[PDB]
Nucleic acid binder design. Sequence first.
RNA 1: AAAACAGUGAAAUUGUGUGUGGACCCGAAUGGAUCGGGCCCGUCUUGAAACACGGACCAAGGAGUGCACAUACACU
Lengths: 135, 147, 55, 327, 55, 182
Amino acid sequence: MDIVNPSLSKVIDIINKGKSKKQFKRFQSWRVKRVSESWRKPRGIDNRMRRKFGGAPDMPGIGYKKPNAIRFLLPNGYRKIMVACVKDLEALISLNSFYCAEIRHAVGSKKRIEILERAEELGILVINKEGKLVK
Amino acid sequence: MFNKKSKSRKLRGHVSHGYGRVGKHRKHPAGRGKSGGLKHLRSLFQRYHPDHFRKLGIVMFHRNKNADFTRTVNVSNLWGLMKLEEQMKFKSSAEVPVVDCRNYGYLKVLGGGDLSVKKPIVVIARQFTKDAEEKINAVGGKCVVAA
Amino acid sequence: MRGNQMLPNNHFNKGSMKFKNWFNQPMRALKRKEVREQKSKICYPNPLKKLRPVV
Amino acid sequence: SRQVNIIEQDGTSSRTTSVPAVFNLNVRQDLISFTHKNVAMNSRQPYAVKPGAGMRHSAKSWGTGRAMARVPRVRAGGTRRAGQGANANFCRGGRMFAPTNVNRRWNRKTLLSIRRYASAMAVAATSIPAYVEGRGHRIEQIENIPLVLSNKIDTEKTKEGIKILYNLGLKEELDKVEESKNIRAGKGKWRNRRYVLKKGPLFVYTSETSFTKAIRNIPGVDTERVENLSILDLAPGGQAGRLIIWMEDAFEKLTEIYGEMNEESKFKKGYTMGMDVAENIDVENIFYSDEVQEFIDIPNFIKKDKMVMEKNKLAEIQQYVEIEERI
Amino acid sequence: DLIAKKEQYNLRMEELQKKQQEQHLKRVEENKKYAEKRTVELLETYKKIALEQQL
Amino acid sequence: MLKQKMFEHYKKKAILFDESRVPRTKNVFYQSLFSLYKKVCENTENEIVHKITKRLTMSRTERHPLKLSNIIEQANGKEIVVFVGKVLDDDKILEIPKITIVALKISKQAKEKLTLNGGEFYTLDKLFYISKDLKDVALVKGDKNNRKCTRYFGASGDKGSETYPRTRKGARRGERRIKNKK
RNA sequence: AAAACAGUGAAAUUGUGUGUGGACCCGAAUGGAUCGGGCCCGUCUUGAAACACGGACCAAGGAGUGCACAUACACU
Ligand SMILES: [K+]
Ligand SMILES: [K+]
Ligand SMILES: [K+]
Ligand SMILES: [K+]
Ligand SMILES: [K+]
Ligand SMILES: [K+]
Ligand SMILES: [K+]
Ligand SMILES: [K+]
Ligand SMILES: [K+]
Ligand SMILES: [K+]
Ligand SMILES: [K+]
Ligand SMILES: [K+]
Ligand SMILES: [K+]
Ligand SMILES: [K+]
Ligand SMILES: [Mg+2]
Ligand SMILES: [Mg+2]
Ligand SMILES: [Mg+2]
Ligand SMILES: [Mg+2]
Ligand SMILES: [Mg+2]
Ligand SMILES: [Mg+2]
Ligand SMILES: [Mg+2]
């Protein structure tokens, strides 16, 4: 869509290139199909990952948490709020400097048209703008 | 607080449910009820319950609670049986109050403390201690024994 | 048995023991009301209850 | 305190009345919630599984030495059911863990003194605009709160009944209820709880009148007597401030029922209307009073900087110079 | 009334903050002048103390 | 020199409010009152204010109640007394000295008696009006050790122990104290 | 014993087509040969990669609960 928050425009690329792409897969989820990828802490008496031997993978923890200012920020430099009514946009009227709107999936075509018309006149960014309404 | 989550809900995912891996959780490792008390549990009894293993005292094969039931009041509380509005009348007034303990379900009078107001009073009851009698007579009151 | 307590004495040993619940309490109350009402018609001018002495 | 105006059939007002003492009492959202929770559990019906389900069959363990797990198994022949795994909770068609049972405690106790106090402060909240709006009743068009309808309402038909309610400004509120009807989400729609509606006005009467059966078919209107007014009706869902239409007789009766401040009610024996630990929520503002400002001491705003130890930054705080002396 | 008195506090405190700040800088400036002279003294007294030992 | 300086610092820090404690009640009127005292503490060193603020954070059991006569007994000739708790009536006493009580709550029967004898009850929000420099106040405290359940703490099978056994009781039944001294 | 809708139609497992590798995971890269680190989990045990036991594969079900009696704590 190629849009950016004006307050961060000259900084956003540093921020984006700085985000981690680490994944914390569950131990041995690569060995048997019955174990999903979702993280669970290992609790075995012998387990090599719990005991932190070199060569085993890394475990999650507080050290990896991002700085408080950068956290929750989308790649366009805004935070997101969910909307499903015309009367929802009315809340964003004070916050449009830092927040943007994302219309919920279940809202149908006829109603979406009414949301977008209101978004234009109030000056609010909607990130699902194209959505289903491309046809 | 009026409501709180339980401990059992946090123990999901932890193997032994907090009973240990070596000790485990078996059915009855120590025996049932309060048994074993002269044997392997002797240390619990001698510490917390030393007068358990004994026979004691005089025996009556049938007793009647109604024939022996009683309730006791002290001299310092006599004026307190009256309502606060009533107290404040008899304090200034020239008349002497006549208090009957039977009416509040008291039958015996004990000698604890001093009388609230140092003016005469008539007290009706079934029994008085020697101290109680002396204290009431000290203020020029009267003790009346009644059934 | 561990720690300090009043020594147990709970009588639940007998396997033939019956339990009685009271879910019927509001309904049986309503039936007793309706029986008194109809009894009161059968003898309309007269009180439902007799006179009794003081002892 | 204040006077309140009575309203006649045609919308005229002429006679006026004083306001009962209960309406000056402060509101405890903690106690309203606690009381709601307990009382709501007194209307339940018991449920349980059948007293020996899962235990019907003739079963026995095969014991070790057969290369099989030592679960009990079904004794049979001629059917695929032979040798299957019988009684345990981990078995198909077996018995559940800790079967549900009728002896559970269905109801809950609450002190009479708390029930009385909670109902008093629920009544109070029905006359604060902030609370009434907060529940979601819409009151933009209503002239004043509370509403008190006169006696001498001679209405008998629903046709004329609605015309009266419209004249009090309730149109938008009533419409909000009618438009609301929807089918519930989830399995409740199979168990006789199919349709859901929003709450609307409650009408409170004390004396028998024809108006009761004139208004009752209008969606979202609800009716109760003042003498047996319940917390389920006064604080739905445990949030307070329901909109109430009073009848003139009922409004005067509140003085006999709850009494006067620091007195004892004749109608509710052993009950009196009490005092909080502080009079208002605003007491934090006492700090700015003259009496406090004399007491305290003058603040220091100047604060020290955080320690720095980097080479270059430290050298501007402590410039070092050599000496030649050997002492 | 108290909502008005809340304003008088905020005003009074801003005056006090500006005042204390100005008094701080003067101390810092005073201290810098004393420190210059004193360092010149002590670097010379070291020199004197050393000659006493040589003698 | 230094050893004194150190100790005098410890003694002070032992009095002052902790500022990482908060009362557990969901009562908004109680939480209002705490907010006032908290904002006073950060602008003063006065020991009475610090003591009061610490006590509002303690539990219902820690805030044990007192009877009217015991307040007078502990007042030690002061005019104003302060108490973070509830004041109850003493049925043994009728006449009392004139006194002003600042406290959290009072019972109906106590308030009448106090008023008939001359005297006032004020809630703790008003302390700063009742007193100008907090020199004429006494601060008073109950003791949770006086609960009847404290008679059972400890072991009755220790030598010289004064504790009572937890026991069934009747006209003949009941375990005695046997290892105490008389 | 099994067996609901002539709905939706997951995983194990199979054929065809197109790509990438020679058991696989973690860290770091090339146009391209690869470099460094890692023994199979769960469990009893002083001590498990073990020549200790259980586990061919996938789905669904599957284990601190209810009542009575004293109790300490938090809240009204
Ligand atoms: K990620
Ligand atoms: K091990
Ligand atoms: K970090
Ligand atoms: K538990
Ligand atoms: K444990
Ligand atoms: K185990
Ligand atoms: K034995
Ligand atoms: K009844
Ligand atoms: K059987
Ligand atoms: K089907
Ligand atoms: K199909
Ligand atoms: K094992
Ligand atoms: K080996
Ligand atoms: K084995
Ligand atoms: Mg054990
Ligand atoms: Mg062992
Ligand atoms: Mg079954
Ligand atoms: Mg569903
Ligand atoms: Mg071995
Ligand atoms: Mg095997
Ligand atoms: Mg499952």
